Design a protein around this nucleic acid. Sequence first.
RNA 1: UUGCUCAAGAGAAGUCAUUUAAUAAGGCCACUGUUAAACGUAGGUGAGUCGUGGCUUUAUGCC
Length: 213
Amino acid sequence: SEEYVDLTFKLRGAPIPLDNGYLTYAALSRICPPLHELKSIGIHPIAGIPTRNNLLELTAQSRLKIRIYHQQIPLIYPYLAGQAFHIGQNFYQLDIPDYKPLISSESVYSRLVIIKGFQDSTNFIEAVQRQMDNLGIQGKIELLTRQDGTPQRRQLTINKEGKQFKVRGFGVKISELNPEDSLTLQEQGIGGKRKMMCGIFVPATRSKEEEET
RNA sequence: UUGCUCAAGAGAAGUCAUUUAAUAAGGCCACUGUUAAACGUAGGUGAGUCGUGGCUUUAUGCC
């Protein structure tokens, strides 16, 4: 539980696209070299009130949250404490960070998970189950659905070099974990693209938040 | 030159021989340094798009 920490920063600035994974990751790596080589690090989605043009308006509860092992914080704290970064032509500022624990919950949820070479929902469930066994985890797999009930896919736009690649993923909800296995899931996660702002798992209330709108 | 003129109280000697201020005594018997306290201000919850390329052994990860 407390053996892993979620670094939270009060984030303020211009409104941000809702598929801003690579943008914020690249900006952070620009203002933090060691972030580009760490392994067990991941970033929580940035909350807020969205807009009509697929952009998110940052609010008071909007904050940049980073999942990290407690034995690697001193490699990231110098480059982010009070620091500011630019996403394109927009200015973003981070305050003094605060530490939040990894709490267990009965059910978990992930906004976007991607595993290479899996586009259909059924094989995605099978692959998430395979990674699920690889971690010694027990639970049941469900996919978050749209208003239509269709499983909801989310897309990440990595704008590497001149080109840009498309990676599509699903929202995965897993329940009945038992708190120890729940903590293992939130800390490991599924998908691997945790630096890419996808694989972090969260308690199940945010799943309802995303399913309402 | 003065009721004066001159004028030694002088020579010599143990204050000595001997003695316990001693014999006996509790400064004792009873006591909580106790009952209470953050190294600590604190500023809170909201999200949508469709089908994959450069590295890596399929898988799976990095961009």
